[PDB]
Design a protein around this ligand. Sequence first.
Ligand SMILES: CNC(=N)NCCC[C@H](N)C(=O)O
Ligand SMILES: O=C(O)CCC(=O)C(=O)O
Ligand SMILES: [Zn+2]
Length: 236
Amino acid sequence: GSTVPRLHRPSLQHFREQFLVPGRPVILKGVADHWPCMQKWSLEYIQEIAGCRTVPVEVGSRYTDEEWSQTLMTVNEFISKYIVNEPRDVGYLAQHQLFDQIPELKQDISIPDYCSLGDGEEEEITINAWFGPQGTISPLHQDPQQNFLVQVMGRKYIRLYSPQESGALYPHDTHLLHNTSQVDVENPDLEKFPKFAKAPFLSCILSPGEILFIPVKYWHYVRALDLSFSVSFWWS
Ligand SMILES: CNC(=N)NCCC[C@H](N)C(=O)O
Ligand SMILES: O=C(O)CCC(=O)C(=O)O
Ligand SMILES: [Zn+2]
């Protein structure tokens, strides 16, 4: 397919009419690139401000693996065990509302102006942190809300499939995982999932300072290319 469009600070109206309403993905430049987090956030700063706090940690390459698990530890332990000391396994501080837990970190980010284009309340917006080493993989899935995924540290390779292509993505037959694809995006078993091949997609490498708008129910697949930290905003 082709690359996700990059727009420098588009007006609220242009974003509403060209991406929000028709549900098209877009990268927003010049919006979050000067949030205090962009130059302040590093291992040391995160250790100093958050190192002592308990956080949920996902262990295993993908959350669809059988030998995959969720455990608890301090931020310092996570960085030590799963980032800097030659990790033995993939650890990932994923989908954790770190900013409700640590209000001092919320100072370093903001609510994107584009969120007020929706029907939801600003404080009903779910803010999650995505902190982990190079190689963390989030398998193909969809979320029930609009998403502003802001990249702070490192880069992320992201694959996007429109909800119309849901048939060729073979969602799990479980209810519980029905929002998660059965296909390994970067190595698809075409013999078991032959329709995944002709399914068109958008993709991009998301870099620090860039915001990825993921339309509601838009399927996304995410792999960290470096030591990465992302902040997702779920809104309506
Ligand atoms: C997205 N990656 C991950 N390693 N954990 C959280 C996955 C739960 C949820 N369904 C989601 O992707 O938002
Ligand atoms: O960045 C990732 O690893 C996945 C993030 C995600 O799934 C989301 O923000 O909805
Ligand atoms: Zn998601």
